[PDB]
Design a protein around this nucleic acid. Structure first.
Ligand SMILES: [Mg+2]
Length: 673
DNA sequence: TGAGGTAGTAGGGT
RNA sequence: CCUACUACCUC
């Protein structure tokens, strides 16, 4: 059925409906010299849009502006990664822009963004950075300070009305010159900024160069930039590249959490949701005060409390860790090997037992083996592994002191090559460090292929598969996928074959390889699948996949999941509740999969039903439950549903180790967690 | 390498 | 929007 109904506020504020003049922006035409180049045209126009000044943005192969064509710089010259271009703008009249047409709507909103940006630029006595305005001094420290404000946004809606988005944020500013910053003691400025203006850079190094040798220190003097400041050492900055000689005294370090890391105290940049809601309401009211588009009106929305997930081990469990005592769901016979990289010998008693306590409490048996080779023994080590694999060892638990990145990846790849997933557990280890080692054991077992916990319930889709791209914007250069159920997890790696196969073939490739591995492990071929992707890549990339599912007669649902851009969700009454579903413009909605502390504010996932007929609540419900099926955590659930959280980790590990043909590892052994 | 969350910054004329 | 890292917490 369905439960709960609640009302919430979105960190959005409704404003004045667009007036006739805005709905029909002026349409300018751009002429370049020399011609751009097939791929350089779009960004080049964006650049002319800025160069021409005013509330002007790119619309198609030209600009669209809200500023009178007369105030814009109709001619000029701009450079791009070398070549410079002369531009010409020809008013081509006015063009209505239907808000109902997402695509045209995309331009009015772009203009709304430029309009909002323009007001901040003329704001007095407030630090501005893009669409963020910082209006209050929060924390402090030697030479540095922290400002508080909000990242802002403005866009036109379905209805054709303005929308203001406000999300509180903190900014880190240095109040000390690079010369004085180094004096103190601090080191590396990744980027830096002119003490006199705002152009940020990426200082390369400090050159032991020429006092005043035309002139460097004179140039900065031919402007007074240097009067009463003491240009220090020769510093070569950078831009997105010429070496632009400079003085470390006319530069200000751009700090990160690091610089201010070691600190003048603990530093909490997170906000409990009420304080967060409080500042949003306030700043929204403050900006609307000088935006002149009416009073911002908090948009409310209907929310629904989704039914909690029934996480089942052998008995009922509240989190994965608890199955170590209750027993796991179904459990195979298994064997694990211990590999000690320090100087100790066997299995730590409390570990031996915990495993023993977990397995006995479960059905089947376990055997603990101990490898007696050392990675350095080379070939003797490999035969030792081949030999462990022979007697049935399924996964290796590695006790060792913290390992350097590359040593770590070398040991894992080496073991993986002999068909052995491994789990590292850092050796200075006490029995009281319950969380750390119990988590390690959860991983080891998962790597062994054991289904520690499963979902007890009913779901539209029998198989759920998450996809992640090998090239960030497309599956052109391969990628990975993972699938959860019965519910037994498995990974899928692309068909090894190189270059640029067609994207949709790579995708369909992933899905068919997943549909197969499922069958050879469940003996059955799912009747309905839930497909999950990130939204980063097009969608037409899943076309071959979709109708392939058409021929085999299996039903589907394509749902995209965004980690951010979901804004914020606050109740009108009561406390933030877990398992919150919030419908928006349709085919899309919000989901609050977690809320686990009160020193922070939850970040809703934003989803889009891009294909399929299953009802949105039904989608929300399942995607929420998939969230409790990650095996490697045990003390806290991920925000992303298991399938996507797993695939990303798989894509990460693939790159970190150097996987091509993981040929001896079973597909239900989550070697990558 | 224990791992999850919320956050801030790097990153996609001199 | 995505990644990366970092900090801060939490189990
Ligand atoms: Mg792991």
């Amino acid at each position: 059925n369905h439960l709960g109904k609640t009302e919430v506020f979105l960190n959005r504020f409704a404003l004045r409906p667009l007036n006739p003049e805005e709905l029909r922006p002026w349409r300018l035409e751009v002429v370049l010299d020399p011609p751009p180049g097939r791929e350089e045209v779009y960004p080049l126009l964006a650049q002319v849009a800025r160069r021409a000044g005013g509330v002007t943005v790119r619309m198609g192969d030209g600009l669209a502006s809200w500023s009178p064509p007369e105030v814009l710089v109709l001619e000029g010259t701009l450079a791009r990664m070398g070549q410079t271009y002369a531009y010409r703008l020809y008013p081509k009249g006015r063009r209505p822009l239907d808000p109902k047409d997402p695509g045209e709507r995309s331009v009015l909103s772009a203009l709304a963004r430029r309009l909002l940006q323009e007001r901040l630029r003329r704001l007095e006595g407030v630090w501005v950075e893009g669409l963020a305005v910082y209006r209050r001094e929060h924390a402090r420290g030697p030479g540095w300070r922290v400002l508080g404000g909000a990242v802002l946004d403005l866009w036109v809606s379905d209805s054709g009305a303005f929308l203001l988005e406000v999300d509180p944020a903190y900014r880190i500013l240095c109040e000390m010159s690079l010369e004085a910053w180094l004096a103190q003691g601090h080191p590396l400025p990744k980027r830096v900024r002119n003490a006199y203006d705002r152009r940020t850079w990426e200082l390369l190094r400090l050159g032991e160069e020429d006092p005043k040798e035309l002139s460097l220190l004179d140039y900065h003097a031919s402007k007074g930039r240097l009067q009463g400041r003491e240009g220090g050492r020769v510093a070569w900055v950078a831009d997105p590249k010429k070496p632009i000689p400079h003085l470390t005294g006319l530069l200000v370090p751009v700090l990160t959490l690091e610089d201010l890391h070691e600190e003048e105290g603990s530093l909490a940049l997170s906000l409990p949701w009420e304080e967060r809601r409080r500042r949003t309401r306030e700043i929204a009211s403050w900006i609307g005060r000088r935006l002149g588009l009416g009073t911002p009106e908090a948009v409310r929305a209907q929310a629904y409390r989704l039914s909690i997930p029934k996480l089942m081990g052998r008995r009922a469990v509240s989190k994965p860790a608890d199955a170590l005592r209750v027993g796991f769901y179904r459990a195979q016979e298994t064997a694990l090997a211990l590999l000690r990289l320090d100087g100790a010998q066997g299995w730590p008693e409390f570990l031996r037992r915990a495993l023993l306590r977990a397995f006995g409490a479960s059905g089947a048996s376990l055997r603990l083996h101990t490898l007696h080779a050392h990675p350095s023994q080379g070939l003797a080590f490999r035969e030792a592994l081949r030999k462990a694999k022979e007697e049935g060892v399924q996964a290796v638990l590695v006790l060792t002191p913290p390992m350097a990145w590359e040593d770590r990846n070398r040991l894992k790849a080496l073991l993986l090559r002999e068909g052995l997933p491994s789990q590292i557990l850092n050796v200075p280890l006490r029995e009281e460090e319950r969380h750390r080692w119990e988590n390690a054991l959860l991983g080891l077992l998962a790597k062994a292929g054991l289904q520690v916990v499963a979902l007890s319930g009913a779901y539209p889709a029998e198989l759920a598969v998450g996809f992640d791209a090998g090239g960030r914007e497309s599956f052109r250069f391969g990628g990975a996928a993972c699938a959860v159920g019965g519910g037994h997890l498995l990974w899928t790696l692309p068909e090894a074959q190189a270059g640029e196969r067609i994207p949709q073939e790579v995708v369909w490739d992933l899905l068919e390889e997943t549909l197969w591995a499922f069958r050879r492990k469940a003996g059955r071929l799912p009747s309905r699948v839930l497909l999950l992707r990130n939204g980063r890549v097009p969608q037409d990339e899943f076309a071959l996949a979709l109708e392939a599912l058409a021929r085999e007669g299996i039903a589907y649902d394509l749902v995209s999941v965004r980690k951010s851009g979901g804004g914020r969700v606050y109740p009108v009454q009561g406390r933030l509740a877990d398992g919150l579903y919030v419908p928006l413009e349709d085919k899309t909605f919000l989901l609050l999969t977690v809320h686990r502390d009160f020193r922070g504010t939850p970040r809703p996932l934003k989803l889009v039903h891009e294909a399929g007929d299953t009802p949105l609540e039904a989608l929300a419900h399942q995607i929420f439950h998939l969230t409790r099926l990650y095996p490697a955590s045990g003390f806290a659930f991920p925000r992303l549903p298991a399938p996507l959280h797993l695939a990303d980790r798989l894509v990460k590990e693939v790159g970190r180790l150097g996987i091509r043909h993981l040929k001896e590892v079973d597909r239900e052994k989550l070697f990558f967690v």
